[PDB]
Amino acid sequence: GSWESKFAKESLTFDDVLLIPAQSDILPKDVDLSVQLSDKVKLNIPVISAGMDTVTESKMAIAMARQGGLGVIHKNMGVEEQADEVQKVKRSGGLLVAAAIGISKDTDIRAQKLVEAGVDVLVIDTAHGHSKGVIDQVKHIKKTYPEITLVAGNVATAEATKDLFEAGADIVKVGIGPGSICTTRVVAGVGVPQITAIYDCATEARKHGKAIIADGGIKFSGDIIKALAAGGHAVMLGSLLAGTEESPGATEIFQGRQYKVYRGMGSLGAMEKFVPEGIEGRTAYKGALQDTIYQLMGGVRAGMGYTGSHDLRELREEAQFTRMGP
Amino acid sequence: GSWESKFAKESLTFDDVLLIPAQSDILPKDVDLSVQLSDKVKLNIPVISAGMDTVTESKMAIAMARQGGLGVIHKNMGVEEQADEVQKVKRSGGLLVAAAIGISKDTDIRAQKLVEAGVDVLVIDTAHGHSKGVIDQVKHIKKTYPEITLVAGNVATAEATKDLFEAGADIVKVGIGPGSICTTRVVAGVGVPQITAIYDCATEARKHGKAIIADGGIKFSGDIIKALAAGGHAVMLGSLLAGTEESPGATEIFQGRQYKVYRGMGSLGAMEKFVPEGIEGRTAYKGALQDTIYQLMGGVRAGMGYTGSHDLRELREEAQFTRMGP
Amino acid sequence: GSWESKFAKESLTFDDVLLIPAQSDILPKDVDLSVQLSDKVKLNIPVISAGMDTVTESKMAIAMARQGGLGVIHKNMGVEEQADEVQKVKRSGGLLVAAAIGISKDTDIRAQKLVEAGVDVLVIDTAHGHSKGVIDQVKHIKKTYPEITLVAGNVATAEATKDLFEAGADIVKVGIGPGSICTTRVVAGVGVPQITAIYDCATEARKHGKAIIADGGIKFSGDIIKALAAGGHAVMLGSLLAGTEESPGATEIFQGRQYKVYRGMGSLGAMEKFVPEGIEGRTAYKGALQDTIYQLMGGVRAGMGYTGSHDLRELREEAQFTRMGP
Amino acid sequence: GSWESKFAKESLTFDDVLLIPAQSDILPKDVDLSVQLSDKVKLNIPVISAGMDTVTESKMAIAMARQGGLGVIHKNMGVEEQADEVQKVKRSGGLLVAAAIGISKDTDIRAQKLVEAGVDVLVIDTAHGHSKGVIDQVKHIKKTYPEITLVAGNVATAEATKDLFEAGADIVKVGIGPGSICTTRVVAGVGVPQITAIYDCATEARKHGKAIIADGGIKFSGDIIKALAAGGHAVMLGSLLAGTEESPGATEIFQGRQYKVYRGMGSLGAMEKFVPEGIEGRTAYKGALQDTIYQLMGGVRAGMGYTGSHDLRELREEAQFTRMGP
Ligand SMILES: C[C@@H](Oc1ccc2ncc3c(c2c1)CCOC3)c1cncc(-c2nc(Cl)c[nH]2)c1
Ligand SMILES: C[C@@H](Oc1ccc2ncc3c(c2c1)CCOC3)c1cncc(-c2nc(Cl)c[nH]2)c1
Ligand SMILES: C[C@@H](Oc1ccc2ncc3c(c2c1)CCOC3)c1cncc(-c2nc(Cl)c[nH]2)c1
Ligand SMILES: C[C@@H](Oc1ccc2ncc3c(c2c1)CCOC3)c1cncc(-c2nc(Cl)c[nH]2)c1
Ligand SMILES: O=c1[nH]cnc2c1ncn2[C@@H]1O[C@H](COP(=O)(O)O)[C@@H](O)[C@H]1O
Ligand SMILES: O=c1[nH]cnc2c1ncn2[C@@H]1O[C@H](COP(=O)(O)O)[C@@H](O)[C@H]1O
Ligand SMILES: O=c1[nH]cnc2c1ncn2[C@@H]1O[C@H](COP(=O)(O)O)[C@@H](O)[C@H]1O
Ligand SMILES: O=c1[nH]cnc2c1ncn2[C@@H]1O[C@H](COP(=O)(O)O)[C@@H](O)[C@H]1O
């Protein structure tokens, strides 16, 4: 029974695996990085910036969209200000833009002002996507605005991925506890190692023909290709893009060294009652986004040249990994 | 035979596992933390403070009982003083209180003075609960005072859990070597990793319908829910509650930093011949108990919201874990 | 299918294994270190110096060849200078010498000038040997100069080892990501732990009767015998021979301590567009090559005395390993 | 075949395992520590001091024999001096004493002078006991002096344990690479994790009814009981007894802290050609042997009280271990 299967499951993280080099015809410089998330949304690079207050505002989204990616404007501000941020991205060349929403009372009026501004996709940003309140809210958003692409999360199982897709989600966001600034593992004793989480969820998504977002735990370009090869359609970066000038955080100095503050959306500072699930820290100033993305995509291109993956579909469906010890 | 099975067993600790997020209807703020340990004892929070000289005296027990928990008054004092501590807790609003006893000569007269004072539960606090001296003493206490709830330990196997319940114990205390201040693993080469110890013992307890106490190795709130989900009815905390003002230890200062001394009951200082099995250290001053318990229970509530565990019975019987590497 | 086998493979590195001591008749001082790589090439010690700009030039190759080994002159210089280096080794007593080549336009004219000078073996030094450009180039070199021994790489699978041997390679170079100065694992998320890589490739080579070069990740003499016992015919050392005086790097001083610069062939400095796959560092000055090789071969001789391996063929075919945790 | 079984074996070290607490009738203070090694040799404690130049001379052997143990006088001195050391131990109350011998020319004359002095047991101290030179020497010693107990080693497999017992050894010494001061794993790439080495060898010894010596890798009292429970009849300590005043090393001071030098018998200093397999270091002054042995045996007694092992035979044959991660 359920008592007997308590400890049956085994899971993997990024550090547990490596990609096996395979037959290659295509050079890194020529591989296809493009990915179709929904019928209306398609990106040139499989990178989305995080719906965080130390990561994405109009500046991040504009720079992300220019490099061939996407940006999710965070919900930790006024309803009026979030609507104003969406307009700025659209007026900057008719670029793709995303915004975050909750499950509370303010959601219904927040969702209308974001769509009005010209948003392409709405993100139901929750700590626990497999909740009754989330399921109902997913149904409501798609019944009110069926023309706007809906992203729902966060989840870490096939069952949770099934339910959200059945409720009305176009894209499911995968990630329970892998984030650099996350303490959910330590505070709630909950989590599913990201490589397995992506794999179990992508196994379900393949049965619906829908997209999954590999969200959190990415430290380097090598973790981008690992996340994508495990089944992820696109990656969500928080820590790697919070040091760039384009992030809302103000540039500071400490002992002649430049730093930008990066905090979790569940840390004391961001929440300004729930017990904190995130921490507040400091990350080194990286400079222009363009340089960070060029370094990260160069690593992904290199790995796709190693695996012989001409596009992301060939990486997601054919690339093989090997398991190793510490 | 026994030679062939020498190395067959595999065991898990807290760091080896994480709880899998499941379908949730209930919010963390509304989950039930209450647990029925025996017919006479029932707590509002599944937390019991340790029967230690740097952890529990009347002050700890009173603060623990007020927050919805329990406190075990240590036996490392005079027979008269231990009886006086029990009276103080009862006179503080008719609160639930526990006390520790050994297997020596002084036990018989110590047990009578504690019951007289108004104690609810007697704890046979031993290093090795699967001893002949403990088995006999469990039978004697229940034959002399059958009206008082008996807790016996410590054990780490189903066989040891079976024997104590058969001898006369109401609740079995699980923990051989997991304690932060414990050196039994290093000194005696003995121990059973706590997650497996709780699981093997709770597998036995389910066949008797009796309660198990997950004792030791808890570092954070995440380890509380892990211990409970593995089969534990309630958790015993030593290290996490020794820094609070309510603990008997005197507040000291070192390099402008406040500290409270926390030592094992088998360290040189506490024993004041047996070879030491515990160490003497220093832990940072945490402040009021109320704040520590609010932080710890908030983490448990959060995890129960993740696993969709409306109460502790649904956590103990249905919650699933995943295994992961370091 | 391919989705189901994504995470089936398990691989081992040097630290995961140790050699089992077996029946011994021969003393370390008397064991045979000689190995036949091709019909024309045979070494007295199974050590080859790396085709790197901080490891091998004529000085290294001469010292290596005198000790009974080989040296691969790097391609990170002018076509004229590389041809001049080969002549110096041949004029130093008619010693065995090797040189590196790519897959670009300059290769065709570079290969002719190296053979003219009197080179014994040509090395197609690539990051990814299982590429179309490498396969074609392997065929071309053997069709133009069939009299010169051809080494091709780098690879990490049996399939890649099969293809190169079928294309025209005499010796296959094994190593994708194990190098001390390598960041391919971190940047590209690609690699195969060296012990398994050598084993899977040597399993294939045994079906062709051809030689494999265990390239990279060797930190000590113990890793030399492990690499050879896993199937390797000879070892390629970069880090262990870059500190010696014979290496092209200029001797420097920092805080009264002597150091020699050692960098990857895929680091920013060596490449002077591709994203860097290697790093630039500093290694302690080791002194004369002779002393380093005497220490390393003494360790291999000792291990061959432990395993009872009278020669390298008895080590490669009969030596057994044990797996262990960290 | 042999190629296919290359990586089949899995081995365990001390840190991988812990002893499972079992039914106990006996108290630690009353457990039997005595062990019969041969017909003529029997000790009160299962501890033997190492045949090392920084561990045992007459002073160590006398103190060891008084506490109920044994001491092995090292062979790294003059033939005359080693004979003089044996006499001193015998004149100190007719105590049990052991001495070390090699496989070289000086052995034949060294063995005669040691027996003359009144030695009880001769130890063929080798790095690799599964050598032809050792096998022949084992036969010769038992054919010349059959009245003296013969100890032979070092080995790490059942096959090597079989051969030495068949050649004429009474006791087989188990340990290839576990020693604190050992670098054989790093230098020769050879070794068998000590827990498995003891187990595979003791499995063989049980088929001959002969004794095995668990030699090396013991850091604490917990590793003593683990070594014995895995199959070892007695333990050999080097590092744990080199800090005591009784060890031949001279007491020194560094930054107001007392230290005693402890080096491997295969380090540069002791060897004063073979490549070094051991290192030279410094260990904190421990004081009187009596205090060190009382702390170590108190830990073993405690563990025997946990496992319910009334004697060493019940520990060796019935005690069960559990495996755990790092
Ligand atoms: C404190 C705050 O914490 C966050 C915030 C943002 C997050 N964003 C992403 C992820 C996680 C996040 C946690 C945790 C899992 O990984 C992904 C929080 C906010 N609202 C609900 C919860 C909650 N609900 C259940 Cl049920 C249990 N606790 C937690
Ligand atoms: C020195 C002292 O050590 C303690 C004290 C309190 C403990 N309290 C809880 C736990 C342990 C404890 C060890 C160890 C196992 O984990 C739980 C001790 C006191 N009396 C008996 C023993 C003993 N009996 C056997 Cl038999 C072997 N040694 C040990
Ligand atoms: C940046 C540079 O990096 C190196 C250089 C030398 C190497 N030499 C040996 C090894 C590796 C090396 C990587 C990596 C694998 O381990 C062995 C490089 C040079 N040209 C091609 C590549 C490449 N092609 C594909 Cl396809 C993906 N990227 C990488
Ligand atoms: C350098 C010196 O090293 C020692 C000395 C003492 C030891 N004492 C115990 C043990 C080991 C020892 C190694 C190593 C294995 O663990 C137990 C040595 C002395 N004579 C022979 C050898 C040898 N022979 C083979 Cl064949 C391979 N090298 C090594
Ligand atoms: O406070 C928090 N707790 C837990 N997870 C968080 C928190 N804030 C954000 N996250 C998640 O962490 C991701 C960032 O991942 P990172 O790149 O590893 O830092 C975000 O996209 C969120 O899904
Ligand atoms: O000296 C000791 N040795 C071993 N275990 C001890 C000792 N003293 C107390 N314990 C146990 O350790 C627990 C405390 O666990 P902790 O919260 O991890 O520190 C107590 O409740 C006891 O069961
Ligand atoms: O920049 C680089 N990236 C990755 N591997 C490299 C690079 N340069 C050299 N290598 C490989 O690393 C080997 C050196 O191995 P080492 O002895 O572990 O340092 C070389 O022989 C190459 O095969
Ligand atoms: O130089 C050496 N190399 C390897 N093993 C050694 C050396 N000298 C002694 N030994 C072994 O190491 C043991 C000491 O074990 P320790 O207690 O872990 O230090 C001795 O009894 C020998 O068997």
Ligand number, closest to the Cα atom of B182:
6
Selecting from D159, D163, D275 the residue whose C-beta is nearest the C-beta of C295 gives D275
Among all chains, which residue has been given the structure tokens 């993280």?
Answer: A13
What b/e string do you get for A80-104 counting C-beta neighbours within 10 Å, with b at 16 or more? eebbebbbbbbebeebbbbbbbbbe
Helix (H) or strand (E) holding A62: helix A58-66
Among all chains, which residue has been given the structure tokens 């690339």?
Answer: A319
Instruction: Quote the ligand 5 centre to D237 CA distance (angstroms).
Output: 51
What b/e string do you get for C183-202 counting C-beta neighbours within 10 Å, with b at 16 or more? bbbbbbbbbbbbbbbbbbbb
Inter-residue contact D307 to D319 (CB < 8 Å): yes
Q: Does B186 touch chain D (CB under 8 A)?
A: yes
CATH 3.20.20.70 fits A21-321, yes or no: yes
The DSSP line for A190-234 is B---HHHHHHHHHHHHTTTT-EEEEES---SHHHHHHHHHTT-SE
Q: How many helices (H) and strands (E) does chain D have?
A: 11, 16
CATH of domain B39-321: 3.20.20.70
Who's near B225: CB < 8 A, 6+ residues apart? Answer: A188, A189, A190, B19, B299, B300, B303, B304, B307, B315
C89 is written with which tokens?
């080794």
Q: How far is Cα A180 from Cα B309, in angstroms, rounded to an integer? A: 27
Instruction: Quote the ligand 6 centre to D228 CA distance (angstroms).
Output: 27
Selecting from B3, B130, B187 the residue whose C-beta is nearest the C-beta of D21 gives B130
Q: How far is Cα B34 from Cα B44, in angstroms, rounded to an integer? A: 4
3-state secondary structure string across chain C: CCCCCCCCEECCCHHHEEECCCCECCCHHHCCCCEECCCCCEECCCEEECCCCCCCCHHHHHHHHHCCCEEEECCCCCHHHHHHHHHHHHCCCCCCCEEEECCCCCHHHHHHHHHHHCCCEEEEECCCCCEHHHHHHHHHHHHHCCCCEEEEEEECCHHHHHHHHHHCCCEEEECCCCCCCECHHHHCCECCCHHHHHHHHHHHHCCCCCEEEEECCCCCHHHHHHHHHCCCCEEEECHHHCCECCCCCCCEEECCEEEEEEECCCCHHHHCCCCCCECEEEEECCECHHHHHHHHHHHHHHHHHHHCCCCHHHHHHHCCEEECCC
Inter-residue contact B6 to D16 (CB < 8 Å): no
Instruction: Quote the ligand 5 centre to A174 CA distance (angstroms).
Output: 11
Please indicate whether residue A192, judged by its CB atom, sits closer than 6 Å to ligand 5: no
Among all chains, which residue has been given the structure tokens 């809906």?
Answer: A150
Contacts of A23 in chain C (CB under 8 A): 130, 159-160, 163
Q: How far is Cα C201 from Cα C316, in angstroms, rounded to an integer? A: 13
Inter-residue contact C228 to C46 (CB < 8 Å): yes
| Experiment type | X-ray
Q: How many helices (H) and strands (E) does chain A have?
A: 11, 16
SS3 D262: strand
D201 is catalytic: no
Give the gyration radius of chain C's Cα atoms. 19
Contacts of C308 in chain D (CB under 8 A): 130
Inter-residue contact D86 to D60 (CB < 8 Å): no
Q: Does C323 touch chain D (CB under 8 A)?
A: yes
A251 is written with which tokens?
């540039």
Fold of C31-248+290-323: TIM Barrel (3.20.20)
For chain B, the chains sharing at least 3 beta-carbon pairs closer than 8 angstroms are A, D
CATH 3.20.20.70 fits D27-320, yes or no: yes
Inter-residue contact A95 to A58 (CB < 8 Å): no
Q: How far is Cα B100 from Cα B137, in angstroms, rounded to an integer? A: 13
Phi and psi, residue D123, nearest 5°: -115, 115
Inter-residue contact D151 to D98 (CB < 8 Å): yes
The answer to whether A20 contacts C325, with C-beta atoms less than 8 Å apart, is no
CB atoms within 10 A of CB A20: 23
**Annotated binding-site residue? C264:** yes
Resolution of the deposited coordinates, in angstroms? 2.2
Inter-residue contact B219 to B241 (CB < 8 Å): no
Q: How far is Cα B97 from Cα C140, in angstroms, rounded to an integer? A: 87
**Annotated binding-site residue? A216:** yes
Give the minimum alpha-carbon distance from A293 to chain C in angstroms, rounded to a whole number. 12
Sequence spans of domains, chain D: 27-320
